Design an enzyme around this catalytic site. Structure first.
Site, PDB file in Angstrom:
ATOM      1  N   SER A   1       7.126   3.061  -8.666  1.00 26.45           N
ATOM      2  CA  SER A   1       6.834   3.326  -7.385  1.00 26.45           C
ATOM      3  C   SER A   1       5.248   3.699  -7.542  1.00 26.45           C
ATOM      4  CB  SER A   1       7.697   4.539  -6.906  1.00 26.45           C
ATOM      5  OG  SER A   1       9.029   4.106  -6.915  1.00 26.45           O
TER       6      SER A   1
ATOM      7  N   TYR B   1       2.824   1.307  -6.255  1.00 23.61           N
ATOM      8  CA  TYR B   1       2.685   0.899  -4.763  1.00 23.61           C
ATOM      9  C   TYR B   1       1.680   1.812  -4.136  1.00 23.61           C
ATOM     10  CZ  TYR B   1       6.151  -2.688  -5.160  1.00 23.61           C
ATOM     11  OH  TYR B   1       6.906  -3.788  -5.408  1.00 23.61           O
TER      12      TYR B   1
ATOM     13  N   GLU C   1      15.918  -1.509  -8.889  1.00 24.10           N
ATOM     14  CA  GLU C   1      15.344  -1.212  -7.559  1.00 24.10           C
ATOM     15  C   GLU C   1      16.425  -1.095  -6.809  1.00 24.10           C
ATOM     16  OE1 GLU C   1      13.074  -4.887  -5.180  1.00 24.10           O
ATOM     17  OE2 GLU C   1      12.272  -4.408  -7.068  1.00 24.10           O
TER      18      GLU C   1
END
Length: 350
Positions: free
Chosen positions: A243, A246, A327
């Site tokens: 994560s 991102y 995910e």
């Protein structure tokens, strides 16, 4: 002057920074002279998504570069890109559609943040930090560093940084407990569902005003479903570094923000490869993209009745998958209850 804790004040300053919004637009190759921050609108962004869907259709139908040119040009007409007196690059493939869909998702959040800054009242007697905090309609508290929840959160960060993401390491600056107005009520039908997991969601700092005020959202109906690996849902990871990638931090901008959300996963639809869906098969509540690596299932702990997969990464036993790590995707915004927000310092080793 504001009575809010200094870390909360710093957070508000970060997320409502107009120059950061402009920088994010420049990074996406947007022409700020032609499309300034103030000129963005939901209508224009929605029209650009629709054109991207037109491009996706031509891409799937095996259209030639000459056949795609007008469609590609239509996208640039709606969202001006920084290319001067030159011909812009052709949007003729799946990678181009995915990249532009990601850019439009960001523009949609930037437009929300800017609309909050422009759509209120002006009172010089009030601290603008308090004024902007109130626009988020979110209770933000600093988690005590010595608490049980702080200990569990630090362990989750410490244990789930993937070996393949070792160009940087992470330092937790602040841990915030967040409560979006009306989200607890919205989550009620899912609050007792099986398989509720505390998962990571990383995003650019410029998206956080939008995320706190509107919650995590699904891309609009106009958005191309093929622009996203598992279609139009809300995406999470169980590996902090997955994560954290991102956040799009850099040596010249090393501070990022990451969310911890309680996600009601229920009956998972397990997939190894891309599946561009908008709705799940009957009985399924979420998609689980099966990673080659998973946090150790024997190390799973419970934080206020929610599973926290904070084990160190081990083989999942899943073979021939497109994913290095797991995910999780939900297709109903009500399945997410945001719990924490972490401010991270990225230490680049490169």
């Amino acid at each position: 002057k504001s009575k809010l804790p200094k870390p909360v004040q710093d957070l508000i300053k970060m997320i409502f920074d107009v120059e950061s919004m402009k920088k994010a637009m420049v990074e996406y190759e947007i022409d700020l002279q032609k499309m300034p921050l103030g000129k963005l609108s939901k209508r224009q962004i929605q029209a650009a998504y629709s054109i991207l869907s037109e491009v996706q259709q031509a891409v799937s139908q095996g259209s030639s570069d000459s056949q795609i040119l007008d469609l590609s040009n239509r996208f640039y007409t709606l969202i001006p890109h920084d290319f001067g007196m030159k011909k812009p690059p052709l949007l003729n493939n799946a990678d181009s559609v995915q990249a532009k869909a990601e850019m439009l998702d960001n523009l949609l959040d930037i437009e929300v943040a800017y609309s909050l800054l422009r759509g209120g009242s002006d009172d010089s007697s009030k601290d603008p930090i308090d004024v902007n905090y109130e626009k988020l309609k979110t209770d933000i508290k600093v988690v005590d560093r010595d608490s049980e929840e702080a200990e569990i959160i630090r362990k989750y960060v410490k244990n789930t940084h993937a070996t393949t993401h070792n160009a940087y390491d992470l330092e937790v600056i602040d841990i915030f407990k967040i409560e979006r107005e009306g989200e607890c009520q919205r989550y009620k039908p899912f609050k007792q569902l099986h398989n509720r997991r505390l998962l990571w969601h990383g995003s650019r700092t410029t998206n956080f005003a939008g995320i706190l005020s509107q919650g995590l959202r699904i891309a609009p109906p106009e958005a191309p479903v093929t622009g996203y690996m598992f279609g139009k849902g809300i995406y999470f990871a169980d590996m902090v570094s997955k994560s954290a990638n991102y956040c799009h931090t850099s040596q010249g901008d090393p501070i990022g923000l990451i969310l911890l959300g309680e996600v009601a996963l229920g009956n998972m639809y397990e997939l190894k490869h891309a599946s561009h869906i908008s709705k799940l098969p009957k009985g399924k509540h979420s998609v689980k993209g099966l990673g080659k690596t998973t946090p150790d299932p024997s190390a799973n702990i419970s934080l206020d009745g929610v599973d926290v997969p904070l084990g160190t990464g081990i083989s999942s036993g899943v073979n021939d998958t497109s994913l290095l790590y797991n995910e999780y995707i939900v297709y109903d915004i009500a399945q997410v209850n945001l719990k924490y927000l972490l401010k991270l310092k990225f230490n680049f080793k490169t």
